[PDB]
Design an enzyme around this catalytic site. Structure first.
Site, PDB file in Angstrom:
ATOM      1  N   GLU A  64     -20.148  14.165  -9.444  1.00 25.28           N
ATOM      2  CA  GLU A  64     -18.939  13.253  -9.527  1.00 25.28           C
ATOM      3  C   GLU A  64     -19.848  12.114 -10.043  1.00 25.28           C
ATOM      4  O   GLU A  64     -19.719  11.596 -11.015  1.00 25.28           O
ATOM      5  CB  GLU A  64     -18.241  13.069  -8.377  1.00 25.28           C
ATOM      6  CG  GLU A  64     -16.628  12.879  -8.739  1.00 25.28           C
ATOM      7  CD  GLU A  64     -15.596  13.506  -7.651  1.00 25.28           C
ATOM      8  OE1 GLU A  64     -15.625  12.833  -6.909  1.00 25.28           O
ATOM      9  OE2 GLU A  64     -14.886  14.176  -8.111  1.00 25.28           O
ATOM     10  N   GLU A 305     -22.344 -14.997  25.359  1.00 28.90           N
ATOM     11  CA  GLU A 305     -21.029 -16.114  25.679  1.00 28.90           C
ATOM     12  C   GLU A 305     -21.107 -17.453  25.349  1.00 28.90           C
ATOM     13  O   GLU A 305     -20.035 -18.260  25.216  1.00 28.90           O
ATOM     14  CB  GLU A 305     -20.740 -15.968  27.216  1.00 28.90           C
ATOM     15  CG  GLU A 305     -20.775 -14.610  27.839  1.00 28.90           C
ATOM     16  CD  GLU A 305     -20.829 -14.570  29.306  1.00 28.90           C
ATOM     17  OE1 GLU A 305     -21.809 -14.960  29.881  1.00 28.90           O
ATOM     18  OE2 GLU A 305     -19.884 -13.804  30.054  1.00 28.90           O
TER      19      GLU A 305
END
Ligand SMILES: Nc1ncnc2c1ncn2[C@@H]1O[C@H](COP(=O)(O)OP(=O)(O)OP(=O)(O)O)[C@@H](O)[C@H]1O
Ligand SMILES: Nc1ncnc2c1ncn2[C@@H]1O[C@H](COP(=O)(O)OP(=O)(O)OP(=O)(O)O)[C@@H](O)[C@H]1O
Ligand SMILES: Nc1ncnc2c1ncn2[C@@H]1O[C@H](COP(=O)(O)OP(=O)(O)OP(=O)(O)O)[C@@H](O)[C@H]1O
Ligand SMILES: [Mg+2]
Ligand SMILES: [Mg+2]
Lengths: 506, 148, 74, 59
Positions: A64, A305
């Site tokens: 393809e 954090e």
């Protein structure tokens, strides 16, 4: 090597461990997956690595994509296929239909193809072959039995020719049939499944070797990542328990702690600091990172954090100038939200950065933050991965864990990493007289003696000051103790009246 | 705005999944943070007294400063207490101060120094001889200093 | 998928408004927020004292408590 | 004391000031009678008190 089958290395990172050596030679391996799973990339990498490392020419059969596209796309990984096609090491054989065609041609073409591919192989003296999306060819108008015969014919001729092949296939369901016609599975010698699992809006790619007729291999799913370097696989279960272990010590960046730990941490060790939010795990991390700089060693602080800015404001307020550590090129700060990726990615970013910076010390501020969302088993797997890397790499590691409940926490970790860890530093709030004080405790240490006291400690600009234990207290861990007194007033320096000076003189 | 306040993130978590919620928090949180906007967020814990975790949804981590309010049962009465649980760049007071509410607003009084188990909502009042030792009747070793 | 390049993976929430499609790449936000030492008052002086001189201008403050404790007052 | 008594509390009120005492109360044919708080008790809230009966300052 005791394996009955000769294999060929793919040089794809991690694949050869999973496959116990690489792809069986002279046979074909089906590689199937849903759209966007990395099939085409795998097969290209297979030919490419083959050419660049073994000078093994390759034939790439495309049904393809276009030869220009296959070349254009490979630039993503910095691979110049055009140059290799030029030197005659790689031959892309265009089998894609025409954007201006008819209808009917999938079997004599299957003969035309066989004869074709044999020409290319013969002409380029090829050893590796990749057929990209055989699926799409009978996606002309066929039924299961027709597919099984045609596949078998192809694979068969290829084996005769002596070629080691990779054939790619499409699937529509992540856990359903192996490939479209539910027939390719059994016609190939080896089967590899590429998955791209959803689960909670994040995507996790896994690679599995389902079968290899003739040899053993690793079973199950393995997480991998597609990067600028192609496929990267982590056989987290292939990691061996043979990490080097020394008796060498290193400082924590806090002297009193070092005493408590019977002479500092072990160089070769995984340390864990847990406590409720606010207890100061982040302070210790700061102090552990700084200490490797004051000793002119390299360290990485992976923060999940706090911002890089915040980390700095806060650090400076605790003494320690992170600014300098940065310049002096001794300290490297990372920073990233756990959500900005899946564990696999995170794990690789960490590894990656450890290679480019060769730290001697590493600190993950809040593993517990990386656990946000993820399943415990996926998390534990991540921990063993970062932990074990660090261990075999002689890199001392300090990991943080925030416990979900302040005071009264009944387990060191909610995720049960206890065991995966060598030294455990424990921080906790103690309600003493209408006030929240902190306590630190060396809960365990594998090769040392460490202090068993639960010392109280204060935090200042100077940082952590570790004082004394709460001897006249019971129910300490409970978080709000009971004070009982056989004494307290007992010596220590009674001798009353005028014991002090005030600011003027002394 | 220079300041922003969300009264009850805990009311926005109603229904939604924890992971969708955490994602929202990081959302409004970091936006505010990168925008130099000081933000004050509210959270109503599901249980009064005895609450064992700051937040039920585990946001505590994604926060710089934590202010905690709690009922304390003192003598058959429901009083309040306020505590600066944590503050990232500063020093903050470690006392669990009692406080009343009037028309004037919030008045932060003193800590419950003579109590145990306050965090729990039902303290144990406990003087039973205050810090002057069982020597309040100071022995009588002092039966000499004074004479005729 | 995008053959040839990279991209963020996974699902990202978006809203269709009067300004069309609006997508928030919540996992694309970076941990590079500016951080100062500047303070600001709470509206409660004593509170300000307890916090060592007020809330930081650059900060996320969280007030938790049972219903009725007075978060809404603060 | 081996009996199940009741208590009432105005836990919260948004615009007013309300009383913070946990007041004992009985029920008769007359309806609800609200008496006094359990001043000399601990852990009322828990349901299973402990009366303090402090030996004062004990002089
Ligand atoms: N440099 C890169 N860094 C990270 N990811 C990349 C890079 N280049 C490509 N990718 C990713 O790899 C994928 C390529 O998939 P690939 O072309 O290998 O085949 P496929 O998905 O198996 O099959 P199909 O032909 O159906 O797309 C893209 O979807 C993209 O997400
Ligand atoms: N300069 C300072 N002086 C006094 N105490 C401070 C100072 N800076 C921070 N602290 C104290 O240390 C705490 C900060 O905790 P820390 O940053 O060490 O990480 P943590 O408790 O492990 O994790 P997290 O902050 O995510 O909850 C504050 O709550 C505060 O009591
Ligand atoms: N004028 C007032 N005088 C004295 N106390 C008051 C007055 N107004 C309200 N209160 C008290 O304060 C409480 C109100 O709480 P507030 O509105 O601050 O929010 P909250 O406790 O955080 O959340 P929620 O109201 O949803 O429970 C009442 O329960 C009451 O005891
Ligand atoms: Mg922190
Ligand atoms: Mg309210």
């Amino acid at each position: 090597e005791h394996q009955a089958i000769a294999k060929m290395r793919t040089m794809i990172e991690g694949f050869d461990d999973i496959s116990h050596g690489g792809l069986p030679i002279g046979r074909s391996t089906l590689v199937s997956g849903t759209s966007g799973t990395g099939k085409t990339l795998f097969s290209i990498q297979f030919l490419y690595n083959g050419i660049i490392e073994f000078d093994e020419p390759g034939v790439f059969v495309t049904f393809e994509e276009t030869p220009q596209d296959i070349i254009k796309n490979a630039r993503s990984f910095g691979w110049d296929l055009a140059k290799l096609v030029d030197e005659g090491k790689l031959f892309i054989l265009d089998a894609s239909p025409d954007p201006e065609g008819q209808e009917v041609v999938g079997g004599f073409d299957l003969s035309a193809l066989i004869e074709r591919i044999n020409y290319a192989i013969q002409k380029y003296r090829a050893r590796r072959v990749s057929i990209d999306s055989v699926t799409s060819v009978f996606q002309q108008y066929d039924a299961s039995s027709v597919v099984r015969r045609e596949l078998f014919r192809l694979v068969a001729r290829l084996k005769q020719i002596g070629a080691t092949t990779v054939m790619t296939t499409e699937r529509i369901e992540e856990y359903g049939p192996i490939a479209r016609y539910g027939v390719e599975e059994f016609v190939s010698d080896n089967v590899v499944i590429l998955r791209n699992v959803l689960e909670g809006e994040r995507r996790r790619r896994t690679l599995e070797i389902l079968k290899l007729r003739g040899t053993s291999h690793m079973k199950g799913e393995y997480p991998f990542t597609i990067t600028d370097h192609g496929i990267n696989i982590f056989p987290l279960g292939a990691m061996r328990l043979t990490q080097r272990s020394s008796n060498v010590r290193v400082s924590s960046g806090v002297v009193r702690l070092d005493e408590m730990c019977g002479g500092g941490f072990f160089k070769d060790s995984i340390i864990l600091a847990t406590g409720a939010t606010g207890t100061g795990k982040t302070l210790l991390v700061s102090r552990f990172v700084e200490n490797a700089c004051a000793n002119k060693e390299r360290a990485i602080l992976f923060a999940y954090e706090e911002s890089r800015a915040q980390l700095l404001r806060n650090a400076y307020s605790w003494g320690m100038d992170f600014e300098e550590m940065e310049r002096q090129n001794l300290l490297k700060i990372v920073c990233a939200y756990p959500e900005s990726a899946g564990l696999e990615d995170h794990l690789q970013i960490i590894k990656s950065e450890i290679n480019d910076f060769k730290p001697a010390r590493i600190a993950i501020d809040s593993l517990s933050a990386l656990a946000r969302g993820v399943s415990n088993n996926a998390f534990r797997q991540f921990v063993i991965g970062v932990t074990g890397y660090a261990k075999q790499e002689e890199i001392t590691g300090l990991f943080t864990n925030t416990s979900d409940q302040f005071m009264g926490a009944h387990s060191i970790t909610d995720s049960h990493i206890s065991t995966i860890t060598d030294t455990i530093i424990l921080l906790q709030y103690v309600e003493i007289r209408g006030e929240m004080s902190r306590a630190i405790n060396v809960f365990k240490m594998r090769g040392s003696w460490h202090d068993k006291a639960i010392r109280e400690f204060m935090i200042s600009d100077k940082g952590p000051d570790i004082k004394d234990s709460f001897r006249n207290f019971e129910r300490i861990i409970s978080g709000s103790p009971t004070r009982i007194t056989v004494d307290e007033k007992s010596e220590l320096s009674r001798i009353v009246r005028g014991v002090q000076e005030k600011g003027p003189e002394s």
